[PDB]
Amino acid sequence: ELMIKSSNAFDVIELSSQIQRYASLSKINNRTNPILKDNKAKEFKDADLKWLKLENCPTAGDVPTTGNNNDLQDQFIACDADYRKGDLSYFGSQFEFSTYVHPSNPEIQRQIKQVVSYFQYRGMERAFIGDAAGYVISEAKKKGFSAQDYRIVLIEPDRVGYFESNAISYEEFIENPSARENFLLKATKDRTLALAVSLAQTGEIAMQRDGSVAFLEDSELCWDTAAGSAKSCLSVRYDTVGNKTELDLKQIDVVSAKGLSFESDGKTKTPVVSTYETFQDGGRAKTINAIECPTGLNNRFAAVVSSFSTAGQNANFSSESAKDSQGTTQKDGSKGPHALLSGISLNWTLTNKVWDVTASIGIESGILPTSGIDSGSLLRNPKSLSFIAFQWCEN
Amino acid sequence: ELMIKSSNAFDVIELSSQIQRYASLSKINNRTNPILKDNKAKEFKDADLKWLKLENCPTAGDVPTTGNNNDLQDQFIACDADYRKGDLSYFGSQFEFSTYVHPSNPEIQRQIKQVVSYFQYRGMERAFIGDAAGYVISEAKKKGFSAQDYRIVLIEPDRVGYFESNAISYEEFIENPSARENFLLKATKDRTLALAVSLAQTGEIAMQRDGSVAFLEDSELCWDTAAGSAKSCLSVRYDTVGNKTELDLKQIDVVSAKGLSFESDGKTKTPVVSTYETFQDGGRAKTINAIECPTGLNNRFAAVVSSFSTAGQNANFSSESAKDSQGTTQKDGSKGPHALLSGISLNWTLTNKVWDVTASIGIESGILPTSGIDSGSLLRNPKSLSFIAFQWCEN
Amino acid sequence: SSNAFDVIELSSQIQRYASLSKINNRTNPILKDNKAKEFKDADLKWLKLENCPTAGDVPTTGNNNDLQDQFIACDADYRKGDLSYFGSQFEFSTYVHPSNPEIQRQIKQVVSYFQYRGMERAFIGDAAGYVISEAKKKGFSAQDYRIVLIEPDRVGYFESNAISYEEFIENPSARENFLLKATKDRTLALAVSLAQTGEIAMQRDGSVAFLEDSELCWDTAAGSAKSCLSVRYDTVGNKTELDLKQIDVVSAKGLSFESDGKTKTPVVSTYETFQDGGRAKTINAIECPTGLNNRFAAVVSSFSTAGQNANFSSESAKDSQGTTQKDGSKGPHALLSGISLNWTLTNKVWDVTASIGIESGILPTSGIDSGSLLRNPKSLSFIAFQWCEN
């Protein structure tokens, strides 16, 4: 049906839907919602609706615009709009709040709990605000407007707003003539009779792509998966025991990263990675490519002893499951028994994105030839050695 | 007017989406969803909807509050809501579950698989439930819900609720008069004719701040970035081959964390972090500060040999790229050749967030003087030693 | 029924379509031409997927594994109701594509016409009311919102007459003025062109992205700047970062990362010593994530030449009672020539063995240790490292 039964009922919904849209927003035209900057638990916004109009109106409203009148602006009602019309005449809205610290917007100091909008009845006979109410409720459903309560109220002026001296639910106004005229008594001359439209702020508020809206405390971000109907979720939770926040990824079996860094006592590192290393024949350094470091982090390295013997070049330690060790070179150049050991040196230097590792094993004197890779009292870059190389980045 | 059908339908979808919302939350107002604590496979909730109302209602419902009434309390339906009216009248909902361990919530014992909400038909000609159901499907599309999988059922009571004895798809009820009239034939006086609603959300549904809307399977969470037009995305996926979920973060170059923990065969670890260590002059114990462990984790330490010789005090190993080693102290007190080695001990003890590290090197007898840091057959906490200290936390 | 919802829903979808160069990683078909104007028809074949029972025009990725981006359903027909879909008029401008010689234009403008078929033509003002209220509800603005009469043109239609929505509503003289020109050579229609003026929400299908530098945040009791995360692009390193650093601890189950293109898990360590008796040591291999293989490395921590006559199992102190002499008794510690640590993976268990070479002529000629070799000695502690990699 595209025919408007009651123009007035239509207007009540049209205005209400925009009040709802406004109450759901933390930002408007990329600026904080004005209503959220104060810290009182209540505020009454006036029937003239200046507070709902753009600040670039001929008469300037309270709703922020972007830097430029250049761009299209988000808006709620026309600059000249007036809803103080008809039998149900807009009377203003009561906003209720609670204190709120937004995790990322410092300008926000409270959050909307509930918005109660009042539409004063100006029909000749008070009782038939009941009929008026019903057409509003009908029109809500027709226009897909979802409010959380409709009530008939009596409101008196307050210190800075209005309060409800008496309230009766819509249902009990039509379907309970005992409570109905129990309520209309109180309709004295400094009280205003009105339809009250309540909007509760629920978990249904949309997560905006600008990140202006936070996930509720203890809520979860979830995926459907091919595992079936079980959802895979993650969350940020705060534990009072220890007073630390946690990004809880434990419903997921594997977190799969590319680059990865973390902090240890203030310092930033990447996870250590390790390799098994031995020297090649010939007595030269073992060259190991330096890992690539993320921005701002420097290369680190450590070599530690795994296996060793005093055989020097006469060995093969490259297999992780067995060691071949043929003895120490004797003065006549032949392989003899394994000499006794006095020390091991492992040195490393980074040049040009390559680590050069050098080593020597010190042995008892008088065994080795005077000259050569194994000579004097030293086995140089020996094959009779395996080490584990550790690499990581840090700042 | 016969737009009583569309209005009845609006309420059906309104209630059904709140029921679906409730079913998707493991916590409500910071407390475990009451329906997830038990361990049965199914449960039927009653048409009176007490279970869906807040416990702070004049007549208390079962939905928890935060405790502090100052707080915004999330809610699903009004305290005086009653959806047992109209041609499609709420009759209760069937929840099916599977057993479940929540990694961070010990109070949870099961997981919702699905919820079906039943609306019994109170029209006097049964055949016209198809017509009523069409309005429901229409109200569903308007709110972003799927138009598929609606069913017309016959349900009967048993001790734990109502079960379906017969079912036909909305589509077959409409198009296949033979199937329709065969289904209706089983609609005996003892069975309740109902529309079975199980809402499914289209991909266009907005994400909500309570987390109750999950991402579609294979959907990603994406950010615009200064890199240009390409998005940067993460996703949660289930591999049917390995039967594991993965949080794929690889499309991002670096995952940058503060504290970090992970699991290895059921145990919680932090990443190993390492320092290069040597003893300072004088032969005394060394102190290394313990890393700060996340709540619940305990400090671990391991020291491994990197370089060593029998020089004892006559050495400097503090550089990673060179070693100064000047031989073992002889009996006259002068530096001599390097003595031969029998062993190396690295020892460590945790005291008040400090690791006390001691070391010694056993050597052949009859070299060292009889007194001093290096004496007898022992080099105490020698300088001629470098070791890598590994630290991590675990439970 | 759902007429007003439908008008805005179709119009938004068409607008979305219009705004897209590719649909399902294939060129938007409407761009593969060079004409300045095209009218697309009421039956909406052009907006339906090609894989519909009756083929539509919207391309497909080819493989049905993933959900195919779509606009309307295969059976959709919006030619009902008092606001009945009449077709969409697109205006284009010239374009030269860098890689596809068939793309020769880009969209400049689209308007969707919904013809009026209500009992009384005057009631189109009411119908336009529901539409505009729905449109604004969803964060849209209509561009030149107007009621029109259209006649067939060279291409598509031209608007022979038009009245703004406000004029039709607030000027009864302008309205019948317009309404009387409604002859048989024209169709009465609502002309809808939607612009997104509200900020939009993140969506279940993941099609909408967080804005550059947006933070995704969670309320907590810890307060500000402790529960937010973001993806930012560092302009100096030209790298993207997932920034979790506000949160005290990221707590994972399994975890993998890449080192120079290779996938790893973090190394995990244990303190190990051999049991009495010279037997080999078994260490259970950690569980690897799908497609990774086990790695192991043992390194020396403490040792002596005591062999069996020792206890190194305590991390804080070492007992070493000397080397077994020829008569089988405990004597002085022998001198050393080497240490081997060996390991082999067999059926999810790492078998670890060790030997310490020592000076000859000390050990007895038979027994647990003989010759010049200590096998799997107690006088040793090593650190064992495990990780997975591909």
Residue numbers in the entry:
A (entry chain B), B (entry chain C): 29 to 423
C (entry chain A): 34 to 423
Study text:
The toxin-coregulated pilus (TCP), an operon-encoded type IVb pilus (T4bP), plays a crucial role in this process, which requires an additional secreted protein, TcpF, encoded on the same TCP operon; however, its mechanisms of secretion and function remain elusive. Here, we demonstrated that TcpF interacts with the minor pilin, TcpB, of TCP and elucidated the crystal structures of TcpB alone and in complex with TcpF. Repetitive TcpA units form the filament structure, whereas TcpB displays multiple functions, such as efficient pilus assembly, pilus retraction, and CTXφ uptake. The structural analyses reveal how TCP recognizes TcpF and its secretory mechanism via TcpB-dependent pilus elongation and retraction.
